[PDB]
Amino acid sequence: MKKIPQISDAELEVMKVIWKHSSINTNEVIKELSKTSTWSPKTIQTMLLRLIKKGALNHHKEGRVFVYTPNIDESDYIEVKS
C-alpha cells in the first residue's frame, strides 16, 4: 500500500534513472539498469516490485510490458518512519 519510499541506494539508482524519463517501460528499464549496473533482471524486478508495493511507482500494463509512472517526485528520497 502507499508508504513513504523506504529506499536503499541500489533502488535510488532506478528512481534516479526513471525520473529522467516521462515514464519508462519494463524492457527499456531492465536494459538501462543492466547497462548502468550489471544486476540480474530479478534484481530489477525486485526493485520495481518494492516501489510498486510501497505505492512509490504506479504502473500501467501496456499489453506485455508495464510502464512506470512515478507517484513520488517532490518527496525526493525522504525515509521517515511511515
Side-chain angles (χ1 to χ4, degrees), residues 48-64:
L48 292 168
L49 182 144
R50 274 276 292 282
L51 278 47
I52 293 164
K53 185 170 265 58
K54 290 188 295 187
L57 271 49
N58 166 85
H59 71 89
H60 298 141
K61 48 172 184 297
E62 193 72 76
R64 183 166 178 79

Side-chain angles (χ1 to χ4, degrees), residues 7-65:
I7 291 284
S8 57
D9 179 78
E11 291 167 280
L12 190 68
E13 290 290 284
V14 331
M15 305 192 93
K16 190 188 297 86
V17 165
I18 292 169
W19 283 313
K20 310 310 298 183
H21 312 141
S22 39
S23 295
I24 175 160
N25 70 72
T26 326
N27 188 85
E28 277 52 281
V29 112
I30 299 193
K31 293 290 184 182
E32 185 66 86
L33 275 310
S34 301
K35 289 167 180 176
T36 50
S37 294
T38 54
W39 300 315
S40 178
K42 185 267 175 63
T43 322
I44 316 308
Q45 291 290 112
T46 306
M47 294 171 164
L48 292 168
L49 182 144
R50 274 276 292 282
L51 278 47
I52 293 164
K53 185 170 265 58
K54 290 188 295 187
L57 271 49
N58 166 85
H59 71 89
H60 298 141
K61 48 172 184 297
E62 193 72 76
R64 183 166 178 79
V65 294

